[PDB]
């Protein structure tokens, strides 16, 4: 019974910020690395970010590393990640996963589009 559900996109100007969530239940969730995953239409899956468990540590991928920030809240079962310094390669559906990979996906999906 694992839920995972993004929030948090829209339309937003390059140079923009905005923050994702990504709400779970149905597993111990402060027990689990997490993971951002995104997919521009016809590009394909792009690792973003991922998280320990506990916080301890977090990974960027080099296209986004310094600009977009993974965090959690274990108390509230929910998983972030702030863009900021939005650029037009960042338009795509955002995906939050229960692994390290990006690969335990769950959810719908965020829309983050950088407007023009």
């Not at 690792?47 to 590393?65: C, L, M, P």
């Amino acid at each position: 019974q694992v839920q995972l559900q993004e929030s948090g996109g829209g339309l937003v100007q390059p140079g923009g910020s905005l923050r994702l969530s990504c709400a779970a239940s149905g597993f111990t969730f402060s027990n689990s690395a997490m993971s951002w995953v995104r997919q521009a239409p016809g590009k394909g899956l792009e690792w973003v970010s991922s998280i320990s468990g506990s916080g301890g540590n977090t990974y960027s991928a080099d296209s986004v590393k310094g600009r977009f920030t993974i965090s959690r809240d274990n108390a509230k079962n929910s998983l972030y990640l702030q863009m900021n310094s939005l650029r037009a390669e960042d338009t795509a559906v955002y995906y939050c996963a229960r692994d390290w990979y990006g690969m335990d996906v769950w959810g719908q999906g965020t829309t983050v589009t950088v407007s023009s």
